[PDB]
From a paper:
Mycobacterium sp. JS330 produces 2-nitroimidazole nitrohydrolase (NnhA) that circumvents 2NI activation, conferring 2NI resistance by hydrolysing it to nitrite and imidazol-2-one (IM2O) instead. The initial characterization of NnhA indicated that, unlike most other known enzymes that degrade nitroaromatic compounds, NnhA is a hydrolase that functions without catalytic metal ions, molecular oxygen, or other cofactors. Despite low sequence similarity and limited occurrence in a few soil-dwelling mycobacteria and Actinomycetota, NnhA maintains the α/β propeller fold characteristic of GME superfamily enzymes and forms an unusual hexameric ring structure formed by a trimer of domain-swapped dimers. The residues in the active site of NnhA appear somewhat conserved in comparison to the ADI and DDAH, with the catalytic histidine, glutamic acid, and cysteine residues present in NnhA as H260, E197, and C357.
Using this process, we identified a variant of NnhA containing three amino acid substitutions (T2I, G14D, and K73R) that exhibited a substantial increase in soluble protein production in E. coli compared to the WT when analyzed on an SDS-PAGE gel. We isolated and purified this variant protein (referred to as “soluble NnhA”) with a yield of 8 mg of protein per liter of E. coli culture and compared its catalytic activity with the WT protein. The purified protein for the soluble NnhA variant crystallized readily in conditions containing polymers, and data were collected using crystals grown in polyacrylic acid or PEG. A combination of single isomorphous replacement with anomalous scattering (SIRAS) using a single mercury derivative and multi-crystal averaging between data in the P1 and H32 space groups were used to solve the structure. With data close to 2 Å resolution (2.04 and 2.16 Å), the quality of the electron density maps was good and showed unambiguous density from residue R11 to R379 at the C-terminus. No additional electron density corresponding to metal ions or cofactors was seen, supporting the evidence by enzymatic studies that these are not required for activity. There is a single protomer in the H32 space group, but the same domain-swapped hexameric structure is formed when crystallographic symmetry is applied. While D262 exists in two rotomeric conformations in soluble NnhA, only one conformation with a slight displacement is seen in the structure of the C357A mutant of soluble NnhA. Hence, it is possible that D262 has mobility within the active site, which may play a role in the catalytic mechanism. The crystal structures from both space groups show that at least one protomer in every structure obtained in this study contained electron density for a water molecule within hydrogen bonding distance (2–3 Å) of H260, that would be also within 2–3 Å of C2 of the covalent intermediate.
Residue numbers in the entry:
A (entry chain A), B (entry chain A): 11 to 379
C (entry chain A): 226 to 302
The structure:
Amino acid sequence: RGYDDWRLSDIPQYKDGISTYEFVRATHEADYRTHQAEPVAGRTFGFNGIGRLTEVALHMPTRYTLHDQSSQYKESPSFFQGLMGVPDRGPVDLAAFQRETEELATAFENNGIKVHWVDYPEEPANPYGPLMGHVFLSWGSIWRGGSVISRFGFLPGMVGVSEYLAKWAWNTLNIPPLVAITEGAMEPGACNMIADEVLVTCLSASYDQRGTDQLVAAISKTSGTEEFHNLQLRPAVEGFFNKATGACAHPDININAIDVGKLVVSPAALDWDARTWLYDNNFELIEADPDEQREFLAPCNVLLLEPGKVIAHADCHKTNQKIRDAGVEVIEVTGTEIRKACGGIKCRVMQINREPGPTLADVRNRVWR
Amino acid sequence: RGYDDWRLSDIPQYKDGISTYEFVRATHEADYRTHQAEPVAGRTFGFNGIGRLTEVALHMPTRYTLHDQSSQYKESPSFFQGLMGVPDRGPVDLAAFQRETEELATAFENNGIKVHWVDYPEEPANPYGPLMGHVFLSWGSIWRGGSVISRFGFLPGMVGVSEYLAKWAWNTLNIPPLVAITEGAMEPGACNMIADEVLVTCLSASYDQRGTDQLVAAISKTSGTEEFHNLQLRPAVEGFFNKATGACAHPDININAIDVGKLVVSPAALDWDARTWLYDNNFELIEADPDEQREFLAPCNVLLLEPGKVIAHADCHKTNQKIRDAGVEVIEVTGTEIRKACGGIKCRVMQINREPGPTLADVRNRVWR
Amino acid sequence: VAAISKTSGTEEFHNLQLRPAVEGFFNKATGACAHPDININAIDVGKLVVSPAALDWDARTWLYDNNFELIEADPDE
Ligand code: NA
Ligand code: NA
Ligand code: NA
């Protein structure tokens, strides 16, 4: 449209003969996401809900992506092993990491999902040392209404990274920021949603109440839903992972949706209140294999492409059979090298756009018991 | 510093033999602004308070900066005149606007203040028409903790602009976003502060309670102060300006600090509660000339360079003499063309960095009555 | 808690409430248990033996703030 062709009718609040007060009031009342964020961006965006995923980003590793190449790791491996708590499976192999990355990318293209590639500078560092954990682009996933700057609870090598990814989203995709988390801890990217307006968090190394409150209030306002629910798990875990039990600081290792009102869930995730809530809201639970969970094969770290279809680690054989048994298609993908750090396949995907999908009301109305 | 020279001692929460829990807890407790925002930015930033201003940005106008060149203005001038409500002083003269802009910039350099220049694309438009009001870079002023995306109450031509300026701040200065205002209305840039932790807002076309609450909560957390106070004026005005009284939707037309515990204030600004509060907190009031105020010469739209020194419109002779009488140096600067839109000199300056300055306790302890 | 509070003979009464992840009595995948006495006990003044599967973040914070020293039970046991 031409610069001199604009007219007052292009302003949605304008009406012929409207008063100043009524125009201003219509403006105060407009929805931020649909009046400002999306039009200005010139597109929709956000990973909220359990609808159809259409657009993601990955990072292809270099030597600088590997945690064991940091001089701070070299100085004390046991310090970082205490923070993450994941079983030692020996050093990361760069070439194999790159291959499993190509395979994941192929899986996306074979399922009609656009993949962007995020690079970091050579010798990437923040004010406190080499970047660490920066392969895990879910930490920069995009919410309805915009990007979020996280407060990392346990990993100093992620300081500056959620900024970097948000900046990248703005410069490359034109997607704006929504909020910076400025108190306590909140890593929203590692959360999952189990319905259009149901978020799962944890209270953990990665989340305190203040951080959670800040995040939930911001994403609530732009979620596009009348209601917003936060299920808050309470795992027993000091750092990121408890290799004695399989409990994890992050929701996305403990639980995810695999279909409408159907969840894959860890043995170590559900306290009584959480269990009661899932029960009252008609969610059907598929239990992850306990050994797969405890040995950190990340069987719950599946990525939902759409209700009834997930990407999962190819070697989570037992959990995957149970998912198939629940009527869900599983796309097996190699994810071995990625687990050598604190995460699996879902953890490493930055989700950019997911179309609106089924709601909590849909879950509740499902007849299955 | 070299990429392989980093050690655990470069992590401020690290201590030899610290437990995972204690390390995580120290991390949850760290201050966002001083641990993350500023280190990652690699500088300090924020205009908060009444301390020494060091860094700003201006926009040098082109024909596309002029409000009367918009096809939507051409279609109905009376519609835009109802929104702003400012006295008609005839069309803007581009050449004169450019000259008064050079003069303002010279004033900054003569006072040791760095000036950045913001350009817009040719034929700048948003989803709803030509940009309008985009010369007013105070709307993009930077807060301690980061940039803000505003919700404009009355001007649709500012949609997309606060995003643009925030994006510019991030790409050019490395300053991150703090929050997007997503409900009601809040134009934080047009507010002023009268002490290190005292903000003045209005309830007006430009601000509702929900928007105000959202903004104040975000900037509170990063203000670097134990307390945060919001004085909320209640002007009687439908749009932006009331040419019968001098009342204005924006704090920065109604009031500003000129020194520690000394304010220049409009006749039309102070309701009883506001007056009581200023009185109880030991603020000395200098009244702006009523005619200067009502005729929209913007005598309160002075910019505080530091306690005891302001930039003011050169033709606000009466108000300026009173400011000098109160012991404050006035740097007179031509601001005629700028007033042909909804604003004056302070309105057009994006404030990027102001050093910490006097506090509310300092105001209260001043012996003057 | 209200009943035993009134007769405890103490000015204050505190209830630490663990939140184990367990459906029935015992979770043989983790060691989590419905009963406190399988999850934790005192062994001395301000010293506790505690299961890996017992302490959620709030419980952990509370024990920390109140100066309790924790001895971890062997995970396999
Ligand atoms: Na719970
Ligand atoms: Na008031
Ligand atoms: Na507890």
